[PDB]
Design a protein around this ligand. Structure first.
Ligand code: HEM
Ligand code: HEM
Ligand SMILES: *[C@@H]1O[C@H](CO)[C@@H](O)[C@H](O)[C@H]1NC(C)=O
Ligand SMILES: [Ca+2]
Ligand SMILES: [Ca+2]
Ligand SMILES: [Ca+2]
Lengths: 172, 146, 141, 178
């Protein structure tokens, strides 16, 4: 019924979609709500589910997932924007497209077996398992999925930074 | 049905020259080093960290014989491929959970391995028939999935 | 994710290809056309007959671009900047076709040059071709 | 300031590596901006190692850690120590840790040249003894002008200088120059 974009779509690639009516919560349909704290600490291994291209670049007909660990957000920027100093920043993304990097992003590298996310996986959730509470929380939303196996870091939009804005839109 | 009689003759002809003992180990060893996410399924085969260990591991070579023979068994009759691989497809879907893409990747590597072992005899029309054979096998082993 | 040891194999393997690169690119183009008939839809006016001059001409320019990329392995997106825009913004070539060409090119190299294709080189040359395809298709929409 | 101390790290030898200067009990590095041979000569003199063969920037020796002390400094080459010659600011930097600088002195390298496995004494594969190990030189960029310089350096006449090794086999070990 409605497709709401972010007020700053050039800084946070996030958009909310409203359905006409509520969807029944079956065993194959279940919402995942927002965390109260930040799980984007280096070493937090999270699961990413994807509907995008596979190693043959054809869209997958089955849902797949892979564990990706969060990475230090200095070597991610230096790998993409050349340096952490704004004056010396130059576009050197090994895929030819510059990711949108700022304080509302965190980068997750490849898995142990050299797995990553190619095109068509944007909008997916970087879900982490809170073993103490046994609940799945969304810590990031995939934004720059064009890295595939060439680059070494995928850019995810932090959920906590947009938690305040998401609640306001839902209320209306 | 699927293939013309001239296409079928060449495919059956080349399959005679193959060395089943070494070709199976070659293709499996290449897939485990080119796409290194299949090492997870073959943890029962010991060390697989380095390419020489992957090639020199006896278990993958023996598993290559099983893979190659099943490919030859599939070539027996094309319309039976649904029933030929139904027993094996269940194993790869309910117990190991092998994604259908890995079937397409292993078949593609098999074409490269056969081209490497043969050479100029891998005529482009010959490989076209082989790819059609590989595409059916990858689909047949995946048609169990639902 | 080409490691420094991976790029050394790529430069050495491509060097052993030598002047036959243009013919190898042409053979791969023809090999993919008949093996994957849906690919011909992207070439509207080109003559698809076997041994065509345009196919031979196209293979030479494709191999020329790849040989340029090897010399600029550290900086690929700039060396392939013009081709990335043409292949994605003008012709809107689907990314699925690139993995078909890369596989056919590897088969051509493996069949014609079997001695040098050790498994170590095969992985290194595969990762190089995967890097090229991602760069060209990174702006598809 | 006699309290401060200079050291080189990750160079493989005492006289080579990335500059490391200690102040207030903390080890730091010098940014690559405005680094010349004059800077390298001053550092090598402070270590008393010898002359400065070359200087390396962009943290080729390794991505350093700790703060950055000196940035945009200018050293005329006469000053005994780096910390004495003029710098724009103290503890001020516009750089990151991918711009750490490092120098390579001459005491440990010994920088010799030789020929191996040729037809005669001065015609064959060229080898370089750097840091006590004998390596080779890559063929890329090897012109007839480079041959003339090497021929004069070794001693044989420069009447005819040609590139490429003769009758020699594939080399062994490191490839130092390129
Ligand atoms: C594409 C055609 C394939 C064929 C025809 C084939 C054939 C076979 C056969 C006949 C077996 C039985 C071996 C036994 O029972 O001892 C087997 C086992 C196995 N296959 Fe496949 N295979 C194929 C693809 C793959 C791929 C790509 C993988 C990737 C990992 C794979 C993973 C396995 C594993 C893990 C086993 C061991 C089963 C066990 O230990 O119980 N298969 N394969
Ligand atoms: C590594 C992969 C590839 C490389 C290096 C490459 C390179 C090139 C080059 C050098 C040209 C010539 C452009 C010119 O002369 O102005 C070209 C044109 C073209 N490319 Fe590719 N290409 C690749 C993959 C593909 C694929 C897989 C397709 C289609 C399935 C494709 C579609 C085309 C077409 C249709 C043209 C003709 C443009 C024209 O005639 O003006 N490219 N490409
Ligand atoms: C080069 O020639 C010399 C004789 O001039 C010979 O002893 C030597 O073996 C040759 N080098 C090689 C690597 O064969
Ligand atoms: Ca600088
Ligand atoms: Ca500066
Ligand atoms: Ca050269």
């Amino acid at each position: 019924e409605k497709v709401v974009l972010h007020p700053n779509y050039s800084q946070v690639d996030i958009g909310l979609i409203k359905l006409k009516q509520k969807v029944s919560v079956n065993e194959r349909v279940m919402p995942i709500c927002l965390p109260s704290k930040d799980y984007a600490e280096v070493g937090r291994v999270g699961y990413v589910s994807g509907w995008g291209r596979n190693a043959n670049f054809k869209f997958t007909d089955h849902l797949k997932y892979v564990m990706l660990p969060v990475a230090d957000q200095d070597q991610c920027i230096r790998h993409y924007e050349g340096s952490t100093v704004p004056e010396k920043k130059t576009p050197k993304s090994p895929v030819g497209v510059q990711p949108i990097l700022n304080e509302h992003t965190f980068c997750a590298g490849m898995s142990k077996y050299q797995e990553d996310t190619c095109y068509g996986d944007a909008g997916s959730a970087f879900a982490v398992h809170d073993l103490e509470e046994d609940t799945w929380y969304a810590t990031g939303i995939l934004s720059f999925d064009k890295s595939c196996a060439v680059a070494e870091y995928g850019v995810y939009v932090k959920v906590t930074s947009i938690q305040d804005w998401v609640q306001k839109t839902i209320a209306e | 049905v699927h293939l013309t009689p001239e296409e079928k003759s060449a495919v059956t002809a080349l399959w005679g020259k193959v060395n089943v003992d070494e070709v199976g180990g070659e293709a499996l060893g290449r897939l485990l080093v080119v796409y290194p996410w299949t090492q997870r399924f073959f943890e029962s085969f010991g060390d697989l960290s380095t390419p020489d260990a992957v090639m020199g591991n006896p278990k993958v070579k023996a598993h290559g014989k099983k893979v190659l023979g099943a490919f030859s068994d599939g070539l027996a009759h094309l319309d039976n491929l649904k029933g030929t691989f139904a027993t094996l497809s269940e194993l790869h879907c309910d117990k190991l959970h092998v994604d259908p893409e890995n079937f397409r990747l292993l078949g593609n590597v098999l074409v490269c391995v056969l081209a490497h072992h043969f050479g100029k005899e891998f005529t482009p029309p010959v490989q076209a028939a082989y790819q059609k054979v590989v595409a059916g096998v990858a689909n047949a082993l995946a048609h169990k999935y639902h | 994710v080409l490691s420094p040891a991976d790029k050394t194999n790529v430069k050495a393997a491509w060097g052993k290809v030598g002047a036959h690169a243009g013919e190898y690119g042409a053979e791969a183009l023809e090999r993919m056309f008949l093996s994957f008939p849906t690919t011909k839809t992207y070439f509207p006016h080109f003559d698809l007959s076997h041994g065509s001059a345009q196919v031979k001409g196209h293979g030479k320019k494709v191999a020329d671009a790849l040989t340029n990329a090897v010399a600029h392995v550290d900086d690929m997106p700039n060396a392939l900047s013009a081709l990335s825009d043409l292949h994605a913004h003008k012709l809107r070539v689907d990314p699925v076709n690139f993995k078909l060409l890369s596989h056919c090119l590897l088969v051509t190299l493996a069949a014609h040059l079997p001695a040098e294709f050790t498994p170590a080189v095969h992985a290194s040359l595969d990762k190089f071709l995967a890097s090229v395809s991602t760069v060209l298709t990174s702006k598809y929409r | 300031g006699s309290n401060l101390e200079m050291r080189l790290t990750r160079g493989g030898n005492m006289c080579s590596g990335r500059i490391e200067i200690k102040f207030q009990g903390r080890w730091g590095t010098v940014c690559d901006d405005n680094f010349n041979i004059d800077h390298a000569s001053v550092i090598c003199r402070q270590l008393e190692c010898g002359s400065a063969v070359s200087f390396s920037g962009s943290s080729n020796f390794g991505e350093g850690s700790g703060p950055i002390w000196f940035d945009d400094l200018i050293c005329n080459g006469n000053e005994s120590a780096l910390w004495n010659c003029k710098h724009q600011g103290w503890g001020k930097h516009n750089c990151d840790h991918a711009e750490d600088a490092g120098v390579i002195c001459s005491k440990g390298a010994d920088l010799s040249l030789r020929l191996v496995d040729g037809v005669t004494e001065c015609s064959g594969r060229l080898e370089v003894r750097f840091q006590g190990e004998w390596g080779t030189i890559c063929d890329d960029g090897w012109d007839s002008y480079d041959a003339a310089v090497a021929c004069k350096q070794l001693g044989c006449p420069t009447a005819v200088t040609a590139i490429g090794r003769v009758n020699a086999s594939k080399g062994f070990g490191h490839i130092w120059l390129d």
